A paper describes a structure:
Leishmania uses trypanothione as its main detoxifying molecule, allowing the parasite to neutralize the reactive oxygen species produced by macrophages during the infection. Trypanothione is activated by Trypanothione reductase (TR), an enzyme that is absent in man but that is essential for parasite survival, and is therefore considered an attractive target. Trypanothione [N1,N8-bis(glutathionyl)spermidine] (TS2), which is synthesized by trypanothione synthetase (TryS) and reduced to T(SH)2 by the trypanothione reductase (TR), is used by the couple tryparedoxin/tryparedoxin peroxidase I (TXN/TXNPx) to neutralize hydrogen peroxide produced by macrophages during infection. All attempts to date to obtain a TR-null mutant in L. donovani have failed and mutants displaying a partial trisomy of TR locus, where two TR alleles are disrupted by gene targeting, show attenuated infectivity and decreased ability to survive within the macrophages. The human homolog, glutathione reductase (hGR), that maintains glutathione in a reduced state, has a significantly different substrate binding site in terms of both volume and charge distribution, suggesting the possibility of identifying molecules able to selectively target TR.
We solved the X-ray structure of L. infantum TR in its oxidized state in complex with compound 3 (LiTR-3) at 3.37 Å resolution. The X-ray structure of the LiTR-compound 3 complex is homo-dimeric and is closely related to the TR-oxidized apo-form. However the Fo-Fc electron density map, allow the identification of the space occupied by the ligand and the residues involved in the binding even if the nitrophenyl group is not completely visible in the structure. In particular, as shown in Fig 8C, compound 3 is bound to the NADPH cavity entrance with an occupancy of 0.8, where it may form several mild electrostatic interactions with the protein residues lining its binding site. An electronic density peak was found close to Gly197, that has been interpreted as belonging to a sulfate ion (with 0.5 occupancy), which establishes electrostatic interactions with Gly197 and compound 3. Compound 3 is lined by Tyr221, Gly197, Asn254, Arg222 and Arg228 a residue which is electrostatically bound to Arg235 (NH1(Arg235)-NH2(Arg228) distance = 3.5 Å). Indeed, the superimposition between TR in oxidized state and the compound 3-TR complex shows that Arg228 and Arg222 undergo a 30° rotation (clockwise and anticlockwise, respectively) to allow compound binding. In particular, the nitro-phenyl group maps to the position of the adenine ring in the NADPH bound TR, and the two arginine residues (Arg222 and Arg228) that in the reduced enzyme interact with the adenine ribose phosphate moiety adopts a completely different conformation in the compound 3-TR complex. As shown by the structural analysis, residues Tyr221 and Asn254, which are involved in ligand binding to TR, are not conserved in hGR, where they are replaced by Ile217 and Gln250, respectively.
Numbering used by the authors:
A (entry chain A), B (entry chain A): 1 to 488
The structure:
Amino acid sequence: MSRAYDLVVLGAGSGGLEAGWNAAVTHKKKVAVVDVQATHGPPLFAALGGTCVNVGCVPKKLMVTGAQYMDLIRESGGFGWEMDRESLCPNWKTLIAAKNKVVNSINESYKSMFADTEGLSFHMGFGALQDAHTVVVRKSEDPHSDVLETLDTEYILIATGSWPTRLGVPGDEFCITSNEAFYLEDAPKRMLCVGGGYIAVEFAGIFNGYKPCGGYVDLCYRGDLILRGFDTEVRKSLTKQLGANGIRVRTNLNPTKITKNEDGSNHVHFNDGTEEDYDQVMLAIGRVPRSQALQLDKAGVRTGKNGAVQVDAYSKTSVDNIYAIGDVTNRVMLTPVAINEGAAFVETVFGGKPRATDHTKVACAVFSIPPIGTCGMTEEEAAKNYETVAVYASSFTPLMHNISGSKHKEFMIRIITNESNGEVLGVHMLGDSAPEIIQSVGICMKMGAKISDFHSTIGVHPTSAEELCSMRTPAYFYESGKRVEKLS
Amino acid sequence: MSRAYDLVVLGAGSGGLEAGWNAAVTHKKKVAVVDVQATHGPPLFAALGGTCVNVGCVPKKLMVTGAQYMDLIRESGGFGWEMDRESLCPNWKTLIAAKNKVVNSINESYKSMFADTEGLSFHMGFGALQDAHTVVVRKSEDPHSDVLETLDTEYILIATGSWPTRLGVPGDEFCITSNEAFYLEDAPKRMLCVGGGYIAVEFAGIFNGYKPCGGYVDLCYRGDLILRGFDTEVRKSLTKQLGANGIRVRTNLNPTKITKNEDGSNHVHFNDGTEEDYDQVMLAIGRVPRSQALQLDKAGVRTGKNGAVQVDAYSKTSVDNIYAIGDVTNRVMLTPVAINEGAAFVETVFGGKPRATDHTKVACAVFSIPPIGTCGMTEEEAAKNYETVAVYASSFTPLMHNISGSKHKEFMIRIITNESNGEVLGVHMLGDSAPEIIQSVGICMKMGAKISDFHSTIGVHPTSAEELCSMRTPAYFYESGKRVEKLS
Ligand SMILES: Cc1cc2nc3c(=O)[nH]c(=O)nc-3n(C[C@H](O)[C@H](O)[C@H](O)COP(=O)(O)OP(=O)(O)OC[C@H]3O[C@@H](n4cnc5c(N)ncnc54)[C@H](O)[C@@H]3O)c2cc1C
Ligand SMILES: Cc1cc2nc3c(=O)[nH]c(=O)nc-3n(C[C@H](O)[C@H](O)[C@H](O)COP(=O)(O)OP(=O)(O)OC[C@H]3O[C@@H](n4cnc5c(N)ncnc54)[C@H](O)[C@@H]3O)c2cc1C
Ligand SMILES: CCN(CC)CCOC(=O)c1ccc(NCCC(=O)c2ccc([N+](=O)[O-])cc2)cc1
Ligand SMILES: CCN(CC)CCOC(=O)c1ccc(NCCC(=O)c2ccc([N+](=O)[O-])cc2)cc1
């Protein structure tokens, strides 16, 4: 009844790698972690540290940080910074160069974690399930290939994460995704970003910031308005400010045919039936769970709609000893969630006294050219699920953009309460510093905060943030139905 | 028993001007507001809108916004922004030019407020008290001079604010203050900022950002460490990062003699007994209340230490009908406070049901080269006033500054709880976006938040802010006395 390892993790992911460390250090279990790579190389993109550290949130943010400098360089002129204006385009070489260095140094950090840690062991391969207690480790994703190790274990945790969705049409093979986008040769001049997910809109921002001289970027969404699930007024204001920063947004539009020209570039045929050339199209259609190879069938774990592992509120699967977390499960699909989900699993199983991860009122951000910070319910949902909701709102252009001449940069806020009790159901912010503000906002909404607590708090004179504490008069209400004013 | 005006305000200040409007609009009282000026001119520096709008927080912030671009221009290089490096100094002309335009347009905003508003009247002069119900309006601060109006009123509100303190030594007349600093001719090459108040440290930052090529800035504090009353580790880390950004800090040092040279520049003699030349010395010694001219004696209002008006928790003075708010009172000396103090006065007097302004746990910021955001108690105080306090701390250098090569920019946080109950007594942050974060932090501490609520909240993956929700292990404690660990 004693296995070689107490716990095998399939994926050194933001969520998985956390679980492994927590088990091994606080509780001193014999832990094994499987992944596909040491460092952040292209062929198989993810690695030790997960999709976040290697081909997501971290490098993404560094490139977003880079692309911002376009606007800041431009903006400084107002405050009296005179310099080379003509032909000031940026150097994609030196960005990705210094980017890789950073990501590389984190992978290097993880190597000497495993070395230094008590009974935490890394195993480079492709984790499959043989049964409830046996984890195969092949050298190919191919179930035919050579077998490097056979890990015998009391528990399994599936933290394999997710993979880019692919639009099924002729020409599809010529496109790229977030993954390939991180290791592009040069900055694309003529760029198309297909889709309207937070990935598309960030990267549109990036390529637009790092486009060469003469170049442009188009965004191309299937539907009406980009960013489904966000506050519709933020969504509208963002599409506007992407307009004003160069990103040519197109809606109710989607490619069908792509074919590659003699110069290397790609020719594209659309829904409307127009034709344009781009140096790359990037498919940001979303992300499917990554359970396609693990053989969950063979161990008696079962998967619902399109691969997602069936779990409960304590992350246990169809089998009692097997568990799953983060993007594979399809619950939320963010890092600090997957990290919580994995940390709760350690308190659950190996820590005796259990706990479930709190999926409600999770604050998150979009790192778009002017970024979004959101936490909790929209109008769309709150008006439906609650009796009488009040909607507060206040857009404003900060003092400084009168000088900088980027007068398009309207900072927006909009609180969504339940009028019955005054409880803040959701806060939605668009503008510079929104992701930093929303974090501490999301602490307030965790404590069930009410609009009375917001405006009664004193405020800092010069920050965008203080306009949270100056919202008293609701702009309008939804009264158990559609939009209205305050009836008896 | 019917006066011409219900309420006379002495000072169209951030606090006073608010009171006037609130009375006049929600409650429809006959209101009069006195001030010294329409627009933001030098001779008498303040104006319609107050010290904040005219010669403080607003222009201050615009210049701080300007000076930041020095570092951002520099920093962009890492991310691949190649341009004119050599001799890229800024243009003080175009800053102050565009600054004034902005401030001017706010003064212009206030003119057409008074015009548009029901029974809100502006009166340009120097408000004195003749008695409990009579307000003189002279054309000089001089009590001898001509009398422009005599305002008859049921109530008076003294919101005259504050004025720069002056170090009493030979040469003092050659120096400047925040006030004169806003309308300087050119950027000073060789600058001295005397004092260690938040004003000094901001302006040091400004002149340092806007110094010409070859120039420098010295800060000169009377005592050991700049910024008394802030968290001593933030204070130390800031002095370090001001070092790294060029500001040569000097402590236990203070001038005695100043004398003006044949080229216009000023020669300075110090405590240690060294001699240096500066184009200006700016005295940021602090700010005294501005009750020196009003003749409070004559109306039976009385003033304590160095002019501050004696008030209670509902802002009433030594006389029942007279009140006072903001910097004149000496309670807190910030805008959004003075605004609350003035808004509560309207609920108090004219609104029937009264209220007192909540002076505890007021969040505020310092807009220094890397800024500070603080709310509530330090260790220094909490260890003294509470039984068993725990101190949490976590400094870190953001992902991006590995690329930008400003590796001095360490983001610091340090929560100070009471270990008995886990209540967050104070949060202290140093680094970029600290003032935006602290606002929503100060909402949490208004709701009496506890460190358990902080770390239990989920977190955004890429922001400095999320390191609030990752602090569990206290770094150390004070156990009813000095610094220690956890004894039975
Ligand atoms: C472009 C992009 C930007 C993002 N930005 C953000 C953001 O700003 N904020 C945020 O909160 N979230 C962001 N995310 C989401 C975040 O990356 C994930 O939600 C998070 O990494 C999920 O963690 P996880 O443990 O489920 O799996 P992951 O962290 O995805 O790790 C999965 C690991 O498992 C490995 N693996 C796969 N198959 C196998 C196998 N058979 N055997 C062994 N190992 C295997 C992979 O190589 C990988 O290293 C972003 C994602 C992307 C793609
Ligand atoms: C350089 C600087 C930077 C600052 N930065 C910040 C910041 O970032 N954040 C923050 O919260 N606070 C800041 N402050 C503080 C803020 O300016 C004040 O606390 C706030 O303005 C106080 O409001 P008040 O109503 O008491 O008086 P004030 O707003 O100071 O207004 C006083 C008005 O009364 C007028 N007056 C004077 N004497 C008379 C008289 N006899 N008759 C009629 N009128 C008269 C003056 O002309 C003036 O317009 C700063 C101050 C300075 C000097
Ligand atoms: C019956 C119609 N409902 C969808 C099944 C519409 C539900 O409400 C919407 O308005 C809605 C919701 C989601 C939605 N997709 C999310 C956007 C996205 O990232 C996306 C973009 C393109 C594709 N695509 O494969 O073309 C898919 C998702 C589009 C519209
Ligand atoms: C008995 C000594 N106490 C002061 C009466 C010291 C109390 O604790 C201090 O360490 C302390 C507190 C405040 C303090 N001054 C505030 C700093 C400031 O802005 C200032 C700078 C210069 C002068 N000055 O007139 O030289 C005054 C204030 C200095 C030291």
